[PDB]
Amino acid sequence: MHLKIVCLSDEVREMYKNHKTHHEGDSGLDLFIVKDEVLKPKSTTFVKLGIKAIALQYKSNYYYKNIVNTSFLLFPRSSISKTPLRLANSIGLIDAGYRGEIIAALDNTSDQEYHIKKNDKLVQLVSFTGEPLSFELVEELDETSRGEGGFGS
Amino acid sequence: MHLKIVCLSDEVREMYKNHDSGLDLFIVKDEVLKPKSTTFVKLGIKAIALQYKSNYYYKNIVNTSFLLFPRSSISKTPLRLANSIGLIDAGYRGEIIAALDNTSDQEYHIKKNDKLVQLVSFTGEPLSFELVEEL
Amino acid sequence: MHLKIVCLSDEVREMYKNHKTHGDSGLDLFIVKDEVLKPKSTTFVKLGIKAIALQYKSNYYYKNIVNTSFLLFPRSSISKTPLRLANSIGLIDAGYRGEIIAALDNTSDQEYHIKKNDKLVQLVSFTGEPLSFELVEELDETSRGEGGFGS
Numbered sequence A: 001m002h003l004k005i006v007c008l009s010d011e012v013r014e015m016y017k018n019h020k021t022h023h024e025g026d027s028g029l030d031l032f033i034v035k036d037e038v039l040k041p042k043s044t045t046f047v048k049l050g051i052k053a054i055a056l057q058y059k060s061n062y063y064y065k066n067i068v069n070t071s072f073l074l075f076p077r078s079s080i081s082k083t084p085l086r087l088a089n090s091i092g093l094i095d096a097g098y099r100g101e102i103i104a105a106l107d108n109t110s111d112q113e114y115h116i117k118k119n120d121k122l123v124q125l126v127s128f129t130g131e132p133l134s135f136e137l138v139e140e141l142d143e144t145s146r147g148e149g150g151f152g153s
Numbered sequence B: 001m002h003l004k005i006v007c008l009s010d011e012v013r014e015m016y017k018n019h020d021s022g023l024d025l026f027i028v029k030d031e032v033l034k035p036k037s038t039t040f041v042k043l044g045i046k047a048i049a050l051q052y053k054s055n056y057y058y059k060n061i062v063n064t065s066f067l068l069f070p071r072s073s074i075s076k077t078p079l080r081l082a083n084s085i086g087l088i089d090a091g092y093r094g095e096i097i098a099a100l101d102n103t104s105d106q107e108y109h110i111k112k113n114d115k116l117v118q119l120v121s122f123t124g125e126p127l128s129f130e131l132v133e134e135l
Numbered sequence C: 001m002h003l004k005i006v007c008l009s010d011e012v013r014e015m016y017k018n019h020k021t022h023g024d025s026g027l028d029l030f031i032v033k034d035e036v037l038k039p040k041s042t043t044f045v046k047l048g049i050k051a052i053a054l055q056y057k058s059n060y061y062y063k064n065i066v067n068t069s070f071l072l073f074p075r076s077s078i079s080k081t082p083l084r085l086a087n088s089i090g091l092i093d094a095g096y097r098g099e100i101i102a103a104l105d106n107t108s109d110q111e112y113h114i115k116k117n118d119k120l121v122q123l124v125s126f127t128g129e130p131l132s133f134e135l136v137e138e139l140d141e142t143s144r145g146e147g148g149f150g151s
């Protein structure tokens, strides 16, 4: 599976240009926390990840009664387990047509505020097939304004 | 992936007659979830999933296993799916149930027509469905 | 999907030789020793096994049998307990050689006793295809694979 990722700021672009934990073969792509943020105790926070993405896979014939955009998954990283933060929707399902910012809905199970920091890695993108992932940085996902493409401001 | 769905009452049939990687499932009856609880919420349907046969390593159409995901909008409630993602094995013929944890210190009211969970294929392929009398 | 499983003790080998729970999409994994989980805690519970998953090679877009990634799911029956899988679903990458661990949140205000033979989690293929398994002594020639020259 190949991800095309639009970074929503120069700061975010710099993070993904120097991605330090992605290796050839990996089934998950770590995503960064992109801004220091305080998560309220016993709360759900919709944490913006500063990127938009599409996933590309080979077309397949499927029962329903070359390369195509496909749905993909947002998993917690195993290392989230040492924190009090949990993914509210368990596993995120990003449909093939979504052009919005990728968000992690994080439950803070602690009675204390939780500080997340730029460069923390709490979630990862994954293919439905679990196949190795590649990615590249692009300026737009498609021609639409939500896709960050097309004419004008 | 194609689902054949048995609705377990005419009220439920009505909901699915008047109903993409996930197929939203409805809460089919108003219900109060106790504070700090797990409730097995019955969804009033049985279902089998059909996909093309594949050669797999071990040791035309087949019924296959499928998944029960939370909807992303569950996040806006205090309810969480207890078993994370439900696995419905190919052999299952029972009613589909969502095990919902109410993390609130107060009771939570779910209503008929609420959509908290969805059925998903292992491949994330588009889903179709039809209503049947029998699996 | 076919799993090659290394059991890390004879006690664990005894369990998997006599499985009893296993065309199924999930392979149940055992709790392998009695353990007490503290209240309001996350415990990294060691499952006493290492495992590689094998599938037929498939062509994938990226810019005969192979090692493949696989998943650690809670069992549906975990729902009746106060235990929850901290990371939702575990992702085990192709060829991973460490002991498989279940990170379990005890959401109770009471300590929770897990017991040898309890089944709380299961291994699952990304395709949901039936699973087979066999017991092996090593995954590869490396010490982390439990193989190769000893001492």
Ligand SMILES: O=c1ccn([C@H]2C[C@H](O)[C@@H](CNC(c3ccccc3)c3ccccc3)O2)c(=O)[nH]1
Pocket: A046, A074, A089, A091, A092, A093, A094, A095, A098, A100, A101, A102, A103, A104, A105, B072, B073, B075
């Ligand atoms: O885990 C997910 C799952 C889906 N989506 C995409 C596809 C979905 O179509 C979209 C839903 N946005 C919701 C929202 C709800 C739960 C988790 C994330 C996002 C939302 C955004 C901002 C505030 C409050 C809720 O996000 C996502 O970004 N992350």
Ligand SMILES: O=c1ccn([C@H]2C[C@H](O)[C@@H](CNC(c3ccccc3)c3ccccc3)O2)c(=O)[nH]1
Pocket: B040, B068, B083, B085, B086, B087, B088, B089, B092, B094, B095, B096, B097, B098, B099, C076, C077, C079
């Ligand atoms: O999330 C799931 C996972 C599996 N199943 C199917 C296939 C599994 O083989 C089966 C387990 N049924 C149990 C049960 C226990 C926990 C969560 C859901 C369901 C049950 C049966 C009767 C009453 C109340 C609960 O349900 C399901 O309906 N939902």
Ligand SMILES: O=c1ccn([C@H]2C[C@H](O)[C@@H](CNC(c3ccccc3)c3ccccc3)O2)c(=O)[nH]1
Pocket: A078, A079, A081, C044, C072, C087, C089, C090, C091, C092, C093, C096, C098, C099, C100, C101, C102, C103
């Ligand atoms: O649920 C999972 C997911 C991945 N892994 C494998 C593949 C992952 O690559 C690996 C992550 N190991 C971590 C760890 C952290 C949380 C939960 C489990 C495992 C670890 C354990 C003990 C000490 C230090 C770290 O475990 C696993 O054993 N169980």
